[PDB]
Paper text:
While the MphA, MphB, and MphH structures are very similar, we observed structural distinctions in all three enzymes that localized to the (a) NPL, (b) β-hairpin insert, and (c) multiple residues in the macrolide-binding cleft. Consistent with the flexibility of MphH in our crystal structure, these observations highlight that conformational changes in these key regions of Mph enzymes play a role in macrolide substrate binding.
Macrolide resistance is abundant in pathogenic bacteria, and is most often the result of GTP-dependent macrolide kinases (Mph), ribosomal methyltransferases, or efflux pumps. Mph enzymes inactivate macrolides by phosphorylating the 2′-OH of the essential dimethylamino sugar, preventing it from binding the ribosome, and providing the chemical rationale for the resistance phenotype. Mph enzymes are therefore adaptable resistance enzymes with complex evolutionary paths.
Residue numbers in the entry: 0 to 295
Amino acid sequence: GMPEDLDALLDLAARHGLDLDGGTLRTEEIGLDFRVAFARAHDGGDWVLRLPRRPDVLERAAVEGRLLAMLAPHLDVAVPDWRISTSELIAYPLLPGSPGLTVAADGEVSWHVDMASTVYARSLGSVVAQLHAVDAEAAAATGIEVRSPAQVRGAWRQDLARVGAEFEIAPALRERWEAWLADDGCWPGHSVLTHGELYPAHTLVEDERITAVLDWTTAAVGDPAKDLMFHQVSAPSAIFEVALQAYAEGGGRPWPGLARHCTEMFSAAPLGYGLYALATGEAAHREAAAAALNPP
Ligand SMILES: CC[C@H]1OC(=O)[C@H](C)[C@@H](O[C@H]2C[C@@](C)(OC)[C@@H](O)[C@H](C)O2)[C@H](C)[C@@H](O[C@@H]2O[C@H](C)C[C@H](N(C)C)[C@H]2O)[C@](C)(O)C[C@@H](C)CN(C)[C@H](C)[C@@H](O)[C@]1(C)O
Ligand SMILES: CC[C@H]1OC(=O)[C@H](C)[C@@H](O[C@H]2C[C@@](C)(OC)[C@@H](O)[C@H](C)O2)[C@H](C)[C@@H](O[C@@H]2O[C@H](C)C[C@H](N(C)C)[C@H]2O)[C@](C)(O)C[C@@H](C)CN(C)[C@H](C)[C@@H](O)[C@]1(C)O
Ligand SMILES: Nc1nc2c(ncn2[C@@H]2O[C@H](COP(=O)(O)OP(=O)(O)O)[C@@H](O)[C@H]2O)c(=O)[nH]1
Ligand SMILES: [Cl-]
Ligand SMILES: [Cl-]
Ligand SMILES: [Mg+2]
């Protein structure tokens, strides 16, 4: 859709050297931190605009920029190349391929790639191995969050306590999550650079192969499984094994309990809803988290 502040946005982009055809500028997605728009330049190039919605987003954006600068040479998929990156505007050339899925504003999901795909599984395992191979000290120097295996497991234990102090949690869910936290077989023995929100909305594809990976704000050194989780819970087990095999062939070090860890981690999504509601303070979020934490 045509932005209501179209006028100011063209001025903003031109002040940064980007001469856009204002007819082409349309808002694609309004995130919690960035408004994202597509636009074409008069020289024909296609562009993505990231517009920070509040000044408190800027120091995280600066870390992500540092991350992306060190990361890009290490991966055989494209990542956003922030040719403009200021306090007022980030912009990068539009990356090729189609999002594997798209989540509308009304929450409905449109799928472009099917999770039974062996080609997609192999591609995902390969890209995640390459990311996981990135030197974690070099990644930590960008400013991203860093957790050892003990701190990964400690953070989940702390989150269960913080959420349980503010919400009623169904006893069967608490017992499942306590059993998960207690089970050494589930937990990683090493930390790696991770994407942190790796699912098909952020993997562009062509012919079921990943061409680019978007949206690196959540990148951190931490649990390898978090970048395989969405595939584990959405793909048939035999297709997740194709991704695990590609991961291992690329140098990844999966552990036997990893698939189960992914499914226990996904069952704990309500903890994330509770943490999000505690951060926003909004009534609708609190009520959504409350319902998810104590299901019928
Ligand atoms: C660079 C600025 C332009 O933005 C683009 O070019 C996008 C990257 C482009 O996308 C590019 C890139 C690519 C690979 O799609 C991602 C290509 O297939 C299409 C034809 O053009 C979009 C996503 C197209 O694409 C369709 O939007 C769907 C959400 C997905 C669908 N797909 C799954 C079949 C795809 O056809 C679409 C048909 O142009 C959307 C249509 C409603 C018109 N847009 C509002 C305007 C006019 C755009 O021209 C633009 C904003 O000015
Ligand atoms: C459209 C479908 C295809 O997708 C593409 O073509 C991508 C956009 C392509 O990228 C395109 C487009 C372009 C401009 O790179 C962005 C071109 O230089 C290369 C040769 O092909 C990737 C990103 C190239 O990998 C990139 O190679 C650059 C030289 C460096 C870059 N990174 C290290 C900074 C790295 O991610 C690569 C060399 O293809 C990776 C290689 C290991 C795997 N390919 C062989 C696969 C099978 C692809 O053919 C594909 C998935 O079927
Ligand atoms: N085709 C294409 N889509 C993109 C690109 N960058 C972002 N998008 C789309 O815009 C959405 C929002 O971008 P994202 O970086 O995730 O920003 P967020 O709103 O902060 O989550 C993505 O999920 C994709 O649908 C790109 O380079 N190419
Ligand atoms: Cl906004
Ligand atoms: Cl983590
Ligand atoms: Mg995103």
